[PDB]
Amino acid sequence: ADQLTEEQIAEFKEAFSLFDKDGDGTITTKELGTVMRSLGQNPTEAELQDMINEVDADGNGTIDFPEFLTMMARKMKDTDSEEEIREAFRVFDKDGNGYISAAELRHVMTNLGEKLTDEEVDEMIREADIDGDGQVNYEEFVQMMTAK
């Protein structure tokens, strides 16, 4: 469910290596807000200094990838991002039936303000047999926008 998918673990791994110039698989605290900003997250300085005070328990002023996975899990656990897209698709379920027209679905994804490109959705529409019927549920399209 709210468990980190193998992809989400890789996405954070690429952003974590961008600042791993020590080939030690670790990064400094000064580059913590920079890695989070790479994923599009903007925590305030106090929010960062608060987690650092707890992680800076070793006194190494550094962070390794496993502990980094514990930081994203604290943000995205009981409040996965999936609850944000599903609640939006809800705004689009005017019939409380759990189904909307592919248009209202592609629209749910664009009005949200996601950095989605019309080409990426066209790929998500190919495996989401959006034909054969005429209307499609979003639970399948929600997991796709998060991470295949």
**Domains annotated on the chain, with CATH:** 1-148 (1.10.238.10)
3-state secondary structure of 3: coil
Contacts (Cβ under 8 Å, ≥6 apart) of 81: 146
Binding residues for Ca(2+) are 20, 22, 24, 26, 31, 56, 58, 60, 62, 67, 93, 95, 97, 99, 104, 129, 131, 133, 135, 140
3-class DSSP state of 80: coil
For residues 135 and 103, the answer to whether their CB atoms sit within 8 Å is: no
Side-chain-facing half-sphere of 28: CA atoms under 13 Å: 4
CA-nearest of 57, 5, 2, 11 to 36 is 11
Report the length, in residues, of the chain: 148
Report the DSSP beta bridge partners of residue 136. Answer: 100
- Report residue 41 as tokens: 């997250």
Angle at 42 between CA 55 and CA 39, to 5 degrees: 85
Give the determination technique: NMR
Could you list the residues known to form a binding site, using ranges.
20, 22, 24, 26, 31, 56, 58, 60, 62, 67, 93, 95, 97, 99, 104, 129, 131, 133, 135, 140
